[PDB]
Amino acid sequence: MQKGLEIAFQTINGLDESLVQALAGVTASDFPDLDIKYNIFLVDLYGQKYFRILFQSKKLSELHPEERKKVREKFDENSRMQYSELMTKYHDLKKQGKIKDRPVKEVHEEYDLWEDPIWQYI
């Protein structure tokens, strides 16, 4: 469990869709307060379309860099987690938790999203 920080995830292939939907379901279900400010949008440019997800908190502060790294590694591992746990925490979570599949937002050429972290690397 973690929050109060801004993080972005990139996905262009490698069955990443599973992680995006899985992580989105666990986070959404784990955060019933609806304080989670995340979303998933699909970008299509240069003849190539890529999927990008943006996750932001409410109490998120500009200061406290020590927290940035904490969430960075925390989310990094949680996402890289083996398929066993990735699928279990996604399906087996049906016990008490759940998952939702919201509509993907279209992305265009401009300066809005993070356009930096997901553009380079997680």
Q: Which amino acid is at 64?
A: H
User: DSSP assignment of 40-105, as one string?
Assistant: EEEEEETTEEEEEEEEE-SS--S--HHHHHHHHHHHHHHHHS-HHHHHHHHHGGGGT-----PPPE
Is residue 39 within 8 A of residue 101, CB to CB? The reply is no
Domain containing 99 equals 1-122
Tell how strand 37-45 and strand 48-56 pair up: antiparallel
Number of domains composing the chain: 1
Q: What is the CATH number of the domain that holds 56?
A: 3.30.70.1980
Measured CA to CA in angstroms, residue 108 lies from 27, 64, 105, 121 at distances of 26, 32, 10, 20
Q: How many CA atoms lie within 13 A of 70 on its CB side?
A: 9
Q: How was this structure determined?
A: NMR
